[PDB]
Amino acid sequence: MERYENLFAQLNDRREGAFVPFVTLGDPGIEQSLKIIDTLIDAGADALELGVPFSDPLADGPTIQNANLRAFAAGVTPAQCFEMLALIREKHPTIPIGLLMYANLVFNNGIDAFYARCEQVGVDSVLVADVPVEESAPFRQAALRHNIAPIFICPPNADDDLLRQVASYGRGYTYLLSRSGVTGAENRGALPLHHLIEKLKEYHAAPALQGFGISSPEQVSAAVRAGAAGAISGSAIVKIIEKNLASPKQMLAELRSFVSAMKAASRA
Amino acid sequence: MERYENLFAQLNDRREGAFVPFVTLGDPGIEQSLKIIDTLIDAGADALELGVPFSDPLADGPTIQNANLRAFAAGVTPAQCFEMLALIREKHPTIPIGLLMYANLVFNNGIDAFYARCEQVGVDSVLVADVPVEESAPFRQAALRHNIAPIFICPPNADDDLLRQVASYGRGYTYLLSRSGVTGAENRGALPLHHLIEKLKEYHAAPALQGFGISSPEQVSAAVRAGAAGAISGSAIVKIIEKNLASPKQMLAELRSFVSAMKAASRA
Amino acid sequence: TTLLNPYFGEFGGMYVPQILMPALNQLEEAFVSAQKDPEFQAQFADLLKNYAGRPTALTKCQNITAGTRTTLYLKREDLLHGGAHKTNQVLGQALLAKRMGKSEIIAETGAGQHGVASALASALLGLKCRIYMGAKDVERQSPNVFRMRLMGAEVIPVHSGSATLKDACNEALRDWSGSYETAHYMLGTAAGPHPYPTIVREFQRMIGEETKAQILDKEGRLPDAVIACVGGGSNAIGMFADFINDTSVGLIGVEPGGHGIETGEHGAPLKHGRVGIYFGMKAPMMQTADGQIEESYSISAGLDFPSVGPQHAYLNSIGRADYVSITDDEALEAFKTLCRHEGIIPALESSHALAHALKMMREQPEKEQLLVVNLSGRGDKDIFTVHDILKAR
Amino acid sequence: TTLLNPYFGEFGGMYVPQILMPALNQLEEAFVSAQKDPEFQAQFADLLKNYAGRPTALTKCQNITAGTRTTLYLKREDLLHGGAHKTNQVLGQALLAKRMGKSEIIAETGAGQHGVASALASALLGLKCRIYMGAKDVERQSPNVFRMRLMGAEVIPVHSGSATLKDACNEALRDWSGSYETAHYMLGTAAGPHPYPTIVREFQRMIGEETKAQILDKEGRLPDAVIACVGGGSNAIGMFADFINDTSVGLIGVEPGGHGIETGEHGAPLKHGRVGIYFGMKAPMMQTADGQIEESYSISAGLDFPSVGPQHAYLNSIGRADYVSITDDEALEAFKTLCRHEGIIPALESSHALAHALKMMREQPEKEQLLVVNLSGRGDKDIFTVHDILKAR
Ligand SMILES: O=P(O)(O)OCCNS(=O)(=O)c1ccc(OC(F)(F)F)cc1
Ligand SMILES: O=P(O)(O)OCCNS(=O)(=O)c1ccc(OC(F)(F)F)cc1
């Protein structure tokens, strides 16, 4: 399908940035996670980034570590996550859906079979957090055979060789890292990335989304100003879940408030 | 003085063996120890062997280890032991009194001063349990300067050189060891010692007293039959103390009974 | 691109977030340079000799083998400073950290021996050391935690996931992914992303080099087999490396069988797990049917790394090395046998290697065989574990 | 009559019951013969190299001495099999037992290291080992008691006297006075009746021989001083012996000062006791004014032998060796310093020797001095003792 290409063309027509929330599938349970995701979309999310709970999320800080643990406390499995993905797509035909995976969950029952299941449920992209471009060949090949965009991370450290590789190999969007370290709202990135954003456009890369530490409206506007196509936010979204565990209704109200503010910051 | 020489001459006149009990001075207290010693003499003891409580009696088995501990529980000191010795001699002018000492108590305030104190209170002999004939020169010299007999142990193992040394160096009596090991009634000696007794007489040794494991009348008669001048018994005497701690009066009755039986076994 | 092959056949690789690739490339380049540098080799040799106590003895065990045609030697890594083989490679990695201009060390630890080894190397060489340890392990390894703190290391309890070794591995990599410019990650076994399996082998290979020289001197020939326990693979690859090209020499790796392979309560991923991708490598793993990483179980917590070094998976796949398992009860009997018949208290880890050599002897007592067991550590640390089991029998 | 002089000046001798003199004469004759026997020397050298791990390292301590004119080396007896120097002489005495046709060993132990050393030597050489231990020591040394029992030794609690080391010494001699024809008494220090002070020195003297060779190789000269802790005297006489005739080399023995000499709660009989006769020798003793033998007190139970070897009393009397004391608190600070600055956990016994070298350096930091500390054992055994004190501060 062409869901990212259609989204970025529509956003470009409106001189608009993308706002893309991350959540963990099944955090804090399947039913409440489906309600959370519908609330994110109704509040104006342009695309989704969705994590499958994994025992060892070594690219994630404590907020998303604790999201994975809540989903496991609710008995959430990868099979249940794919059932959720099919339902989400059945409700929402055009929104791009990206997964954040760890390699073992993709490799476990065969790389090709993983990407075939992605295609069946209507996923648009997969970011495998612990597969660097150097190891990516079988993942990107399987992704593209099943009409899935393989997403790569561009560190702020990225040398010219790596920018060329990410530009050549990635599709859908380029994940522009704000900083070194792991996911978390407590650490803000401070890279102008004007040159990285400029070099990616020169090398005809998929449009850049700036992510890691994006927690406020001004960071969304700043990302777009710097020439990024949009911004991704997770720990900030997940923190609203963690804060409001005792009140599922207030949790949805605060998620709606936050996403509506972050999306407003992307508009012309 | 001539107390051993006079005793053995008198016993020889009556074709009689010596019976010599051992007790620890101040076991189980000073007053009861003085009563015990008078009871041993009244019951027919020919001589006494008296121990001074010492922290590390490494020639003694458990019965006499426990006698030393009872005397220490009563606060008994070497100074109190010498006060007891003076009183015992003041009551009993002719009975030979032998001490069983450990080297540190003799060396502590000077070897000569120890033997001078022995002479002052009327002791007749000292056996230093942890001084072999090889180390004995300063002890035997100090003893003889103060009219004290130095007593040496003749092991059943004794080679000819050692018999000659003990015969030359000892006075009063020769302590004939029943066996290897340490003091105790639970272990009986089984050396004929006819040859050792014969060799000692050939070398003009002080008369032999057989000791270690002597607990019964038949062992007293057997010692005399073998040509010994007598027998020494300790753990058997001390065991009667340990058994009767709760009844001081019955303790004295049982000591009297035992000593009267052991002395009877020595008579012609 | 890399200077060295990151794979052993299909096994190994560099499965880390992109942000960590420069740290691995920097480490590989420093290592390749260090291995050509006579000054680095001389400094490492000086520390191994004068601080750690190398060479270690090779002890013959005639009391154990009496009445059989087995000759058994023990390579005495139990006599190395710190009481286990781990000291060899932490000294080399600490020197690499200094070569790269780093002043700080990060380490993971399970039962604590790698934490203690990392802390003692850091204390000697003037490095600031922080150690990640699963909160469950912190709770049950107070002696090793206290040793690390006496040596001036920071011990950081890890409460995420299962609060055990794999979670400490993750936390070490999360820290390194922000701190690599000033901190070296001193990985504790011959596993993880390239170049660690290669580095740890080369910084342990004096075990096998010395064993070869010592057995030639004593026996005039190579061993029929060298036998080593396999937790993550470092002491075993250190013994094996110098014999790989001696095709007559058996290479036997012993994984923990725990309560028995059939119970599922074991730590034998190489022969009884499933290949996966975790901790930066493609290797056999303890994992659920769904691909969640599991714990290894053994009476010996030191054997509970829930995967295995990729070079062992490779040597197995080509048939150069053979891998077996030994249960808790077999290891315990070997522990008691060595204590009683040689007066050596072995680590329960090493007791697994000894137990398999005892089986080789006892099953075929008239087979002529010259065996070397890598005695990877001493077992003072295990006497209460063993007391608690014996007392409950 | 004896073959060798039983005295060192006025100190030493053979103050045992007459029944034990043949056992001492037999032992002296076997020892004199063994020292002329190349086969005995080769067997002992084989055990020391291939079982115990000799030679031990000599470790330079630049982190500790930085900014001073002290050079400090540690002789690493902590790396010997069993974790202390005691292993050297028990292997020699076990070989003497076999030379005399004996199949059984008797040993005394206080804090338990001699019991463990005796048990491991007996296990290796096929001897039946029984160990006397004061009931109070049995109660507070469960780890060492368990080690002795794992190695197949009988541990016999002693309830007589103070139920501590001197009482176990007595019980060992009481047993030997009945069993000498089939049992060897494996005395644990350079003390007791002749020939033990001589034997234990000669079976420890490789400490100083190796140190001399190692310091000549590294520094091209002899040390200014060699420094060793003194409990009964074995590790110190083993370090000192080969330097006695090198009159330029200081010999410094360190007794435990406990809570302070002035408190009376110490273990420094050589400088703060009184000569007496006990345990078969004339030597300085901890004793009451009345001549009852007392206990030594130290934070380190291993330094609590309540006398001292007669050769140390002799070397002091002629001014060849100097004896000092170090308090509990000084030893504790040295323990912490070595852990933090060299990554070596020293025995609290050995920490007394290190503390005195630290004082020599710190008091006169511009004095040029080349020092060797005998690091007589490792301190894994002491980490809870140290934890309990630190935690209570
Ligand atoms: O807002 P934050 O700081 O929580 O960051 C959002 C992260 N969510 S995500 O799925 O984009 C994401 C993307 C990449 C990650 O790791 C990798 F870079 F190594 F690949 C991890 C998570
Ligand atoms: O009847 P037992 O078995 O208790 O023996 C009596 C012992 N009492 S004693 O004073 O004669 C005595 C004599 C000698 C001793 O030791 C030595 F031989 F080494 F010198 C100990 C005690």
Ligand SMILES: *Cc1c(COP(=O)(O)O)cnc(C)c1O
């Ligand atoms: C750490 C340890 C092991 C297991 O680790 P490997 O990397 O497999 O060697 C084995 N033995 C001992 C003594 C250890 O300390």
Ligand SMILES: *Cc1c(COP(=O)(O)O)cnc(C)c1O
């Ligand atoms: C036994 C011991 C000592 C004290 O005994 P010495 O005979 O004086 O050497 C000292 N250090 C250690 C480590 C010991 O084990």
Ligand code: NA
């Ligand atoms: Na493993």
Ligand code: NA
């Ligand atoms: Na002492």
